[PDB]
């Protein structure tokens, strides 16, 4: 027998199941309603079980708008958590949290297999025992902060400084150089900016190689928490059954923790320190621990970060940061000079840059870049007020080398074509070490520094000069 | 805040205004001390204003039920005087904060949950039903003065935040000015009014007021820089700002008429024309060589040259 509603309080709804045939926790329940007369309103809400309460009573949190419910109406059972279709049908399309697509390109048929969201994490005996460095082909990123297959990377930057093109470059590079599938998830993101992102993807021909999930801000907190785990299934199924490196972009982890805060306040749990849920350290961990690398493939994630009041000691940044393996920054003061991308070479850090992982020569060449850029970073203040020619030989050579490491950072990308016509180039990881070693010795000091702008190989730099 | 000087100014107001204004005067006390309330009745019986004034009391020694309605009793009188008889009315209401505070103490027993700092959840609903009753209408004009006590000398408190939305002109008092010994303790920076418009006060008012306000805002950070950087490391042009702002702030003090007990002095009287005139002179540079201490607790500018003569 289908469940019956006896209690409604805004986003939170209680259900009843007679005879004790209750469903499981984190299951999905659906309601189908239509007005029999003008005295009723249509609604197709769905609910997720979160708690049992005894006397055949269950608590549920709403996934959409919940107005118009009536005592005595019926809610049907599904027997499994929310399920998303997986396979070839997922690529090139945008879906909501529940699964239905948001575009007008039709539905998805019922014969495709569907995978659940809530599943146990991969076990101990299935993890990869080697630090396999993912190859990105981006000149600065492959040098100062190598990415680890199965690890996590955070992004910081100024307002609007290329925060979206650096994501769309990676999908194209993954498709071109190694081949793979990428998923973009929006955690409670704006409905307006989805259109901008969709069109900027479409004019680049990149949406065809990625799958996307949106949860809008007008959605209740019950659905805004589930979007990341929803996209995780699509990311995982291609690493499980097919096998290749997969990317999973998460737009903002802050709103994930904040949705956790909202739903915990709604669930009746007493606020923990600073008002968060008591289960803050375990509800986040279930997301971070599914993104791993087995012996056959990997899921790697890129995440942007917000801070509540620049308080790193706040529980959310404190619990997030330890789970991150790399972090890079973008500065607007360099973007004003046109150095795309304007990645900070000093605020970017990663745990992988160790001699045991990358070898002796690549470690030396990666660390000495930061060592030698510090002289410029400190002398820029006195340079800004007095001329260079009166200084010592050390300041001159520092400026002379730093003006080339400063401009070598740039590289033309494949997405850049629709506003600056360029073929698009790639930086080999083995060649990057040779190139930076040769520059840092001063073998290319005679080239004009601004000629070093926007390209991905030193040999092309030589040709252009 | 606590012990800043509200009552001396409010009694100066009822001394100066009610003695001349022919409107029916009502003074209502909500949260002050009983001794002041008992002294004021005898002072009224001597002043001759008793013929044209009524009073309501009950003060602190009673539970919240009386301290809530004692504010509205005087308004209930002023309402009949305005709506039917039609003469002008003066309404002084003293420490309406305790109307709010009383509502807290019963709230915990009435079944309402606490909120924020601890005030009852019905702050706005209870307060609006009072603050919108005292209004001027087309039939009659009501002039109303109120006293507000900040709960902890800090303004980011829900009670002052809720009270700030109904006043037409507010004057703030800072306990720092109380400790500086320059009375009254009105801080010029945060004191604002709807009257500062060109069509009401004229152009001779606006420019001088804005210049004085801007200079007193500018001095605020330079005086803090002085606390560390020294006293002559700052440029002489910067030091002139302090050199004149000190005089400007000192001349703001006034010797009141109701403070004769605390001062031992009869005071002095100034019209507004002399105030605008004196500020124009102090900005003109006519008084650069008179000592700052000569400007403490004086009225008309003409007194200052006498006090220097006294020194």
């Amino acid at each position: 027998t289908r469940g019956r509603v006896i209690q409604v309080m805004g986003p939170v709804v209680d259900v009843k199941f007679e005879n004790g045939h209750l469903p499981a926790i984190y299951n999905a329940l659906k309601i189908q309603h239509k007005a029999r007369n003008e005295n009723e309103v249509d609604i197709d809400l769905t609910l997720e079980v979160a708690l049992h309460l005894g006397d055949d009573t269950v608590r549920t949190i709403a996934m959409a708008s919940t107005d118009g419910l009536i005592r005595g109406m019926e809610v049907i059972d599904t027997g499994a958590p929310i399920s998303v279709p997986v396979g070839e049908v997922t690529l090139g399309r945008v879906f909501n949290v529940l699964g239905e697509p948001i575009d007008l390109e039709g539905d998805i048929p019922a014969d495709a297999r569907r995978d659940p969201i809530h599943r146990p994490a991969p076990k101990f005996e299935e993890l990869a025992t080697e630090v396999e460095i993912l190859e990105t082909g981006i000149k600065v990123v492959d040098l100062l902060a190598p990415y680890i297959k199965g690890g996590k990377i955070g992004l910081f930057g100024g307002a609007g400084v290329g925060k979206t093109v650096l994501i769309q470059e990676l999908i194209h590079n993954i498709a071109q150089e190694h081949g793979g599938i990428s998923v973009f998830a929006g955690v409670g993101e704006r409905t307006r900016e989805g259109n901008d992102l969709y069109h900027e993807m479409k004019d680049s021909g990149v949406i065809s190689k990625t799958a996307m999930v949106f949860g809008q801000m007008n959605e209740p907190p019950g659905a805004r928490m589930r979007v990341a785990l929803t996209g995780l299934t699509m990311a995982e199924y291609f690493r499980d059954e097919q096998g290749q490196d997969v990317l999973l972009f998460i737009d903002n982890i802050f709103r994930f923790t904040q949705a956790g805060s909202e739903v915990s306040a709604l669930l009746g749990r007493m606020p923990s320190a600073v008002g968060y849920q008591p289960t803050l350290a375990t509800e986040m961990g279930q997301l971070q621990e599914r993104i791993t690398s087995t012996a056959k493939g990997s899921i790697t994630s890129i995440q942007a970060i917000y801070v509540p009041a620049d308080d790193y000691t706040d529980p959310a940044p404190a619990t997030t940061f330890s789970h991150l393996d790399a972090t890079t920054n973008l500065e607007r003061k360099l973007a004003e000079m046109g150095i795309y991308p304007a990645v900070d070479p000093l605020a970017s850090t990663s745990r992988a840059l160790a001699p045991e992982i990358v070898g002796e020569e690549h470690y030396q060449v990666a660390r000495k870049v930061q060592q030698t850029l510090q002289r410029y970073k400190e002398l820029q203040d006195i340079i800004a007020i007095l001329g260079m020619d009166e200084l010592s030989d050390e300041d001159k050579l520092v400026v002379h080398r730093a003006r080339r490491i400063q401009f070598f950072l740039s590289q033309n990308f494949h997405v850049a074509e629709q506003f600056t016509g360029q073929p698009g180039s790639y930086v080999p990881v083995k060649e990057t070490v040779r190139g930076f070693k040769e520059i840092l010795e001063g073998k290319y000091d005679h080239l004009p520094e601004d000629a070093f702008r926007l390209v991905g190989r030193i040999e092309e730099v030589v040709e252009k000069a | 805040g606590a012990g800043v000087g509200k009552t001396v100014l409010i009694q100066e107001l009822i001394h100066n205004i009610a003695q001349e204004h022919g409107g029916i005067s009502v003074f209502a006390g909500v949260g002050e001390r009983t001794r002041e309330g008992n002294d004021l009745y005898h002072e009224m019986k001597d002043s001759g204003v008793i013929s044209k004034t009524a009073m309501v009391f009950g003060q602190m020694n009673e539970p919240p039920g009386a301290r809530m309605r004692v504010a509205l009793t005087g308004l209930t009188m002023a309402e009949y005087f305005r709506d039917e008889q039609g003469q002008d009315v003066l309404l002084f209401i003293d420490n309406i904060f305790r109307f709010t505070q009383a509502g807290s103490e019963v709230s915990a027993l009435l079944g309402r949950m606490p909120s924020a700092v601890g005030y009852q959840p019905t702050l706005a609903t209870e307060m609006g039903q009072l603050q919108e009753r005292i209004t001027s209408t087309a039939k009659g004009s009501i002039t109303s003065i109120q006293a507000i006590y900040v709960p902890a000398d800090d303004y980011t408190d829900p009670a002052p935040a809720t009270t700030f939305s109904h006043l037409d002109a507010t004057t703030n008092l800072e306990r720092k000015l109380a400790e500086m010994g320059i009375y009254p303790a009105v801080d010029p920076l945060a004191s604002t009014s709807r009257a500062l418009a060109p069509e009401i006060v004229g152009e001779e008012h606006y420019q001088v007021a804005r210049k004085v306000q801007q200079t007193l805002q500018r001095y605020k950070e330079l005086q803090d820089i002085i606390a560390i950087l020294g006293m002559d490391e700052l440029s002489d042009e910067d030091k002139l700002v302090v050199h004149r702002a000190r005089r400007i702030q000192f001349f703001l003090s006034q010797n009141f008429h109701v403070a004769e007990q605390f001062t031992g002095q009869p005071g002095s009287y100034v019209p507004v024309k002399e105030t605008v005139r004196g500020f124009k002179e102090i900005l003109e540079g006519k008084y650069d060589h008179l000592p700052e201490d000569a400007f403490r607790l004086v009225g008309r500018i003409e007194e200052v040259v006498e006090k220097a003569k006294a020194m």
Binding site: V274, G275, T313 | -
Partner: protein, 56 residues
């Protein structure tokens, strides 16, 4: 006098270079104290609110 006037500006340079440092440490430690005071205030406020809610 020229030598002394040059050494004077050198000494002033050194004085400002020492003076400009401890400020940042003092700001960072006060800012930490500020977040701790915040967190303590919010925690105390929620604890009082939830105790009142449980009582009533």
């Amino acid at each position: 006098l020229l030598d002394a006037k040059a050494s004077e500006h050198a000494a002033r340079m050194t004085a400002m270079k020492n003076a400009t440092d401890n400020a940042n440490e003092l700001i960072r430690t006060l800012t930490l104290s500020y977040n701790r005071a915040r967190q303590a205030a919010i925690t105390q406020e929620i604890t009082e609110i939830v105790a009142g809610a449980n009582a009533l």
